[PDB]
Design a protein around this ligand. Structure first.
Ligand SMILES: *CCC(=O)Nc1ccc(C)c(Oc2ccc(Cl)cc2)c1
Length: 208
């Protein structure tokens, strides 16, 4: 799932950690993570950067099989109250057969222009016969937290899906030493209506 032979995505969790007292805590998940359906990559070009270093140039440069598309169904049903000890975090994990230095570039884009870019570099750890790259408790950007607050204030869910059409996040995982594309996840977001659930669909990007 969401992976090639050279790199595999194990877990992708974006959460909100809350504590009202040491007696009772709670971590609420916004999004959580063998043949993939095919989606034309040209359909999502406008939503992601088209300039140098954009999704289009990356496709030509990098391997075609490494690119994917994810439709996240985000769970926005959570009580947002006092600041207290609240933490917005993204925990990711990648496991790979080969040893390398991995760079995780998270670009949160609005209206097809990158607003905030988070570049992180992780070193290899040998665990259970493979190399596991774990990015633990990435503190969420102040932009993204204020963004989530902007969503929850919206009265009707149908409105949220409308603004989120312009909200995209392009994960690009790269080998630092070789400058080779290892994995790429174009993510689009929609709200899922449920008492407590999160859904996600994964597609493979192709040019045809
Ligand atoms: C600001 C850094 C960051 O990691 N932002 C980020 C990237 C990806 C994902 C999936 C995040 O989690 C959410 C995105 C969108 C919504 Cl509506 C909810 C959570 C956050």
């Amino acid at each position: 799932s969401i992976g090639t032979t050279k790199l595999r995505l194990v877990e992708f969790s974006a959460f909100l950690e809350q504590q009202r007292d040491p007696d009772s805590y709670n971590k609420h998940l916004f999004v959580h993570i063998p043949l993939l359906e095919s989606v034309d990559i040209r359909q999502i070009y406008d939503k992601f950067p088209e300039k140098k270093g954009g999704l289009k140039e990356l496709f030509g440069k990098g391997p075609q099989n490494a690119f994917f598309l994810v439709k996240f169904w985000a769970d926005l049903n959570c009580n947002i109250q006092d600041d207290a000890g609240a933490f917005y975090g993204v925990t990711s994990q990648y496991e790979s057969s080969e040893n390398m230095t991995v760079t995780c570039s998270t670009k949160v884009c609005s209206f097809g222009k990158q607003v905030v870019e988070k570049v992180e570099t992780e070193y290899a750890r040998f665990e259970n016969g493979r190399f596991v790259y774990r990015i633990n408790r990435s503190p969420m950007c102040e932009y993204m937290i204020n963004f989530i607050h902007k969503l929850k204030h919206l009265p009707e869910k149908y409105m949220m899906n409308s603004v989120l059409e312009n909200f995209t996040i392009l994960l690009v995982v790269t080998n630092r030493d070789t400058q080779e594309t290892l994995l790429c996840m174009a993510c689009v977001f929609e709200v899922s209506n449920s008492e407590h659930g999160a859904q996600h669909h994964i597609y493979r990007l192709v040019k045809d």
